Amino acid sequence: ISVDALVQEFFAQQSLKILPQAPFGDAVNQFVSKDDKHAVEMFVMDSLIEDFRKVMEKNF
Amino acid sequence: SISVDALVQEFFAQQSLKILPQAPFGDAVNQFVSKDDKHAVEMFVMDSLSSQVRGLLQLDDDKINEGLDSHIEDFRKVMEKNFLS
Amino acid sequence: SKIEKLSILGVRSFGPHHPETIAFNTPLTLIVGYNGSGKTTVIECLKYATTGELPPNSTRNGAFIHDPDLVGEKEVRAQVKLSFRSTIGESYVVTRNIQLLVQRNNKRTQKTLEGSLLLRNNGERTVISTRVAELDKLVSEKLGVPPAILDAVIFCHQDDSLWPMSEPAALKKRFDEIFEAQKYTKVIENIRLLKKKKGDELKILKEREVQDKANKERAEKVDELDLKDAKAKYKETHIKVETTKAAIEDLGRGMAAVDHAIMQYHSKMMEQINRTIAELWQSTYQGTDIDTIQIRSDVESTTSSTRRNYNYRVSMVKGDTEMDMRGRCSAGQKVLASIIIRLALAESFCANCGLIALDEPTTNLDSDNIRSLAESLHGIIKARQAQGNLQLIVITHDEEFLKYMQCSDFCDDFYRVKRDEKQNSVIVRESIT
Amino acid sequence: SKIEKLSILGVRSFGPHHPETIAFNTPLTLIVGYNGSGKTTVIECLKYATTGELPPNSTRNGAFIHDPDLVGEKEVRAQVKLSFRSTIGESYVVTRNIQLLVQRNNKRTQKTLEGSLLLRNNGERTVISTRVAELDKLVSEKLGVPPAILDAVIFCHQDDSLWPMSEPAALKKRFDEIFEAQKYTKVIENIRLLKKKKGDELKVETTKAAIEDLGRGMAAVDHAIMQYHSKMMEQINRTIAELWQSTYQGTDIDTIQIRSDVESTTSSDSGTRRNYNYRVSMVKGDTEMDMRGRCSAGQKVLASIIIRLALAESFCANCGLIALDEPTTNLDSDNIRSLAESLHGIIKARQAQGNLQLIVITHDEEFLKYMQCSDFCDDFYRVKRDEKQNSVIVRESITR
Numbered sequence: 008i009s010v011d012a013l014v015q016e017f018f019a020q021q022s023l024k025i026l027p028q029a030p031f032g033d034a035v036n037q038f039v040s041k042d043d044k045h046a047v048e049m050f051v052m053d054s055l056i057e058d059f060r061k062v063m064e065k066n067f
Numbered sequence: 068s069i070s071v072d073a074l075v076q077e078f079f080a081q082q083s084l085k086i087l088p089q090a091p092f093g094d095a096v097n098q099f100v101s102k103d104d105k106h107a108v109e110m111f112v113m114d115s116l117s118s119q120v121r122g123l124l125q126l127d128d129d130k131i132n133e134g135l136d137s138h139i140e141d142f143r144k145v146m147e148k149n150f151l152s
Numbered sequence: 153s154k155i156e157k158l159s160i161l162g163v164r165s166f167g168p169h170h171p172e173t174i175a176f177n178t179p180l181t182l183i184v185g186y187n188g189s190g191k192t193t194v195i196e197c198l199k200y201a202t203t204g205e206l207p208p209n210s211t212r213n214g215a216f217i218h219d220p221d222l223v224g225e226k227e228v229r230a231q232v233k234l235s236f237r238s239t240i241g242e243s244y245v246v247t248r249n250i251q252l253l254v255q256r257n258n259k260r261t262q263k264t265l266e267g268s269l270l271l272r273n274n275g276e277r278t279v280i281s282t283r284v285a286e287l288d289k290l291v292s293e294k295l296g297v298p299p300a301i302l303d304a305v306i307f308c309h310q311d312d313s314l315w316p317m318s319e320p321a322a323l324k325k326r327f328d329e330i331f332e333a334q335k336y337t338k339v340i341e342n343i344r345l346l347k348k349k350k351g352d353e354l355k356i357l358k359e360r361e362v363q364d365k366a367n368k369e370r371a372e373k374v375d376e377l378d379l380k381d382a383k384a385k386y387k388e389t390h391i392k393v394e395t396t397k398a399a400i401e402d403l404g405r406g407m408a409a410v411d412h413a414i415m416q417y418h419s420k421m422m423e424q425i426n427r428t429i430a431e432l433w434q435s436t437y438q439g440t441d442i443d444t445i446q447i448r449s450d451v452e453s454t455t456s457s458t459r460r461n462y463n464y465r466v467s468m469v470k471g472d473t474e475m476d477m478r479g480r481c482s483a484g485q486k487v488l489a490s491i492i493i494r495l496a497l498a499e500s501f502c503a504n505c506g507l508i509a510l511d512e513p514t515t516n517l518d519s520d521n522i523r524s525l526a527e528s529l530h531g532i533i534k535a536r537q538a539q540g541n542l543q544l545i546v547i548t549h550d551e552e553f554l555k556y557m558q559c560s561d562f563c564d565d566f567y568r569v570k571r572d573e574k575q576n577s578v579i580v581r582e583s584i585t
Numbered sequence: 586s587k588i589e590k591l592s593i594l595g596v597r598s599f600g601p602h603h604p605e606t607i608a609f610n611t612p613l614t615l616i617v618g619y620n621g622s623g624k625t626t627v628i629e630c631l632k633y634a635t636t637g638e639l640p641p642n643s644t645r646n647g648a649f650i651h652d653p654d655l656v657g658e659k660e661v662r663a664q665v666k667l668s669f670r671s672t673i674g675e676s677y678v679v680t681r682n683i684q685l686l687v688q689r690n691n692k693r694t695q696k697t698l699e700g701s702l703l704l705r706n707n708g709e710r711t712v713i714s715t716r717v718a719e720l721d722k723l724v725s726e727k728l729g730v731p732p733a734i735l736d737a738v739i740f741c742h743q744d745d746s747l748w749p750m751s752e753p754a755a756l757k758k759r760f761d762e763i764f765e766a767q768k769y770t771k772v773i774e775n776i777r778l779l780k781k782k783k784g785d786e787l788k789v790e791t792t793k794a795a796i797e798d799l800g801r802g803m804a805a806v807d808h809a810i811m812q813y814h815s816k817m818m819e820q821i822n823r824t825i826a827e828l829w830q831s832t833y834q835g836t837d838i839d840t841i842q843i844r845s846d847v848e849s850t851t852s853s854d855s856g857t858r859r860n861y862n863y864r865v866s867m868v869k870g871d872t873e874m875d876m877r878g879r880c881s882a883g884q885k886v887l888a889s890i891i892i893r894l895a896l897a898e899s900f901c902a903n904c905g906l907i908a909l910d911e912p913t914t915n916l917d918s919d920n921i922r923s924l925a926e927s928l929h930g931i932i933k934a935r936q937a938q939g940n941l942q943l944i945v946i947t948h949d950e951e952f953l954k955y956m957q958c959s960d961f962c963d964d965f966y967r968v969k970r971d972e973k974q975n976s977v978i979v980r981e982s983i984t985r
């Protein structure tokens with residue numbers, strides 16, 4: 008039983024449409040445990056259409 | 068079977084005081100600590116002095132001039148005796 | 153002298169409709185029960201009866217008192233009767249009543265009702281006091297035991313039973329309470345103020361005197377009535393002046409007298425206590441880790457426009473090393489040493505009535521230490537029995553400890569505290585064969 | 586995730602010249618000894634290697650360290666070696682060395698000398714860290730166990746063993762630690778500020794895109810936290826109820842439940858902020874009443890153990906690691922047997938999985954017996970004091 012498992016479960020219904028949901032989840036866990044402060048935002052800065060988001064998920 | 072109150076008495080018997088009865092002095096400190104009342108010791112001292120000064124005022128002039136310490140010495144021993152009674 | 157009987161109503165696990173009564177035997181009372189039976193509660197009631205102090209952490213929500221909600225009432229009342237007799241040997245009863253009320257709210261409010269201390273002599277009962285604050289002082293005086301030590305060692309709460317192992321700060325406060333150190337400091341300061349006031353008055357009257365001296369000599373030269381008045385003034389002033397000088401010598405010695413007696417009292421007690429701890433630790437503690445345990449006490453003096461400051465520590469010694477026990481002692485070692493220290497404290501400190509209550513002394517102790525502790529207690533029973541100066545109370549759920557204790561000593565009875573059909577605590581006396 | 590072996594030198598009653606090693610059995614390691622043997626000392630060492638935390642009350646004055654005075658040293662060094670296995674099954678070793686130095690006027694200084702964590706693989710060993718702060722975080726990560734519960738639940742000090750029964754303030758502090766509540770609150774506050782940060786700075790499709798994502802992410806964290814807390818609580822409470830029912834003899838109390846209470850803050854910008862107040866409650870018949878201030882000593886110990894077991898099961902990754910130091914404290918004849926039986930049941934149920942490590946420390950005969958033979962344990966450890974009064978570790982085969 009997990010805490011980000013529920014985070015991911017939340018994004019089952021509605022995809023967060025222009026970031027890949029799965030990389031985000033590890034990112035927030037990395038962000039809170041690996042505690043790099045910029046990365047999640049930077050990850051999004053690099054992130055720069057439904058198809059492209061799908062590709063983002065596959066690559067991860 | 069020893070106590071502070073008993074130990075203050077022995078000290079006094081070693082180094083005796085001149086105008087203050089010693090039994091009531093020890094009772095007074097006991098009352099202050101046990102009966103918690105703060106002005107018992109002051110009330111005692113003030114009484115002892117007032118009693119002493121009254122007796123001394125009564126004394127005759129010839130007696131007074133020659134010695135005064137001897138009379139306060141007498142009255143304190145009377146007070147101790149009164150306490151025992 | 154002795155505590156005779158205790159009646160409990162509506163306290164803790166005890167029902168609020170029928171009281172449960174315990175008769176305290178001499179010189180050993182054994183109380184046995186399963187976990188949560190209501191054994192320790194008995195000791196709590198004994199402390200409440202004598203001290204008027206409720207158990208720690210039971211101060212709010214009426215934790216001490218039988219829950220109102222359980223019995224289908226809105227209010228519950230608790231009454232604790234303790235029948236005891238003084239050193240002189242006349243019997244007193246102290247009754248304490250507390251009510252717990254449920255609010256039409258989440259909160260519950262607790263209030264202390266009337267308490268009476270009555271005296272039974274001849275065929276009648278006479279009220280000695282109906283006022284509570286008067287009760288606490290009276291029970292301690294009639295028993296011959298100080299209130300603090302009654303709280304600290306005789307009826308020490310199972311939750312607080314390890315206090316001699318506490319951090320240095322807490323240890324210091326408990327000892328200061330036991331020794332009345334603070335009250336003594338207060339009395340010393342009181343004497344000093346009295347001395348200084350008289351000292352100031354002394355100066356004024358002294359100078360008044362020699363002024364009055366000049367007037368009396370002035371008058372001798374002239375010679376009537378006016379002369380006589382001057383003579384009288386001189387006598388009155390010279391007398392007061394000498395009286396004060398005598399007062400300062402007396403107050404100073406009395407100051408010194410108390411300070412000395414205190415320090416001498418403290419030192420001699422510690423030494424006496426320390427010797428008992430050693431005797432007991434050697435007799436009791438199996439294991440080679442420690443030969444004896446001693447309390448070390450240190451004094452510091454502070455300067456003010458006079459004060460004795462005491463710090464206490466409990467120490468280990470095996471093979472000449474002096475080791476502080478704090479942070480360095482085992483669980484079983486903590487339990488045994490605390491028991492030993494309380495036993496010593498009572499023997500030396502308390503007026504010599506063999507009153508102590510031990511609640512599950514066997515906590516965290518191995519078989520040997522259990523066997524050993526029982527044997528020491530049994531030894532203490534045999535020596536102190538003939539005189540008739542011992543009441544020892546043991547709370548336990550341990551069968552091994554039970555066996556070594558119970559049969560040989562003059563107890564034809566012991567008490568079992570079990571729960572009834574309705575789940576209220578009952579106190580039943582089991583007759584030994 | 587297994588712990589394999591622990592080697593102890595110069596700590597407590599243990600000598601600084603010859604080390605002592607304990608090998609941890611599966612699924613039960615029994616350590617028995619007389620009072621002051623040095624049993625609790627072992628868990629402390631187990632606690633230190635994994636958490637980098639010294640026992641409470643032993644932080645300074647080199648209380649933890651075998652006293653210099655006995656041996657004629659100015660310095661004593663204590664080292665703790667723990668060889669363990671990862672969740673993945675890679676083999677690791679963690680060592681901690683500490684220095685205690687004696688100066689003139691009898692004053693002493695205590696210092697952490699060095700910490701190293703190496704990996705045992707193939708024939709070669711590789712060092713991951715010499716930094717202590719890294720060590721603590723990594724070992725918690727490597728074992729698959731959060732650092733907080735290692736301190737609170739897995740290796741609870743005999744002195745702190747009753748914490749689930751402490752006053753509401755302290756109890757709340759402990760639970761908040763276990764739930765990592767503070768860190769989650771900080772990360773959510775962090776993302777919203779970042780969102781607003783970018784909003785101010787404000788391709789168009791990317792922006793509208795980012796706002797949709799950010800609202801979603803913050804909502805997920807907020808929702809996941811609540812859901813996590815509620816879920817964890819309920820499974821824990823069910824474990825507690827079951828255990829207390831199976832174990833606790835006596836009819837005075839039917840069950841025990843942890844009650845959690847919330848203060849809720851409502852924001853459109855910040856989502857929801859939750860504050861938790863915890864209390865342990867009895868139930869007799871239909872009535873529920875708060876235990877604190879109302880329970881027996883035997884009830885206190887038993888309830889505390891049960892809360893610890895439930896917490897470990899639910900919170901910790903399903904590796905059966907827990908250490909119990911004298912569980913039989915203040916328990917009567919019936920309750921001791923019952924605990925042993927419950928423990929034995931727990932071992933049998935959880936054994937099939939294959940990874941359970943249970944450590945029981947005791948000096949009690951009846952309790953020792955029920956566990957001893959029936960369980961698959963082929964060995965146990967006894968702790969004795971030698972003539973130099975140093976603690977030694979002896980392994981006894983029950984066969985002979």
Ligand SMILES: Nc1ncnc2c1ncn2[C@@H]1O[C@H](COP(=O)(O)OP(=O)(O)OP(O)(O)=S)[C@@H](O)[C@H]1O
Nearest residue numbers: 165188189190191192193217218219879881882883
């Ligand atoms: N306010 C209360 N109202 C009703 N019952 C209470 C209340 N407070 C406590 N109790 C119960 O009363 C009992 C009190 O038992 P205690 O005398 O403190 O323990 P005990 O008999 O010493 O058990 P041990 O020490 O573990 S052998 C417990 O079972 C509590 O559940």
Ligand SMILES: Nc1ncnc2c1ncn2[C@@H]1O[C@H](COP(=O)(O)OP(=O)(O)OP(O)(O)=S)[C@@H](O)[C@H]1O
Nearest residue numbers: 482483484597598621622623624625626648650652
């Ligand atoms: N800093 C220290 N220096 C020297 N000896 C110490 C130190 N700390 C503790 N000890 C000794 O080591 C013992 C403490 O070890 P523990 O692990 O508590 O023993 P134990 O097996 O837990 O005993 P219990 O809990 O009562 S069954 C005591 O007997 C002390 O004499």
Ligand SMILES: [Mg+2]
Nearest residue numbers: 191192310882
């Ligand atoms: Mg009890």
Ligand SMILES: [Mg+2]
Nearest residue numbers: 482483625743
């Ligand atoms: Mg221990």
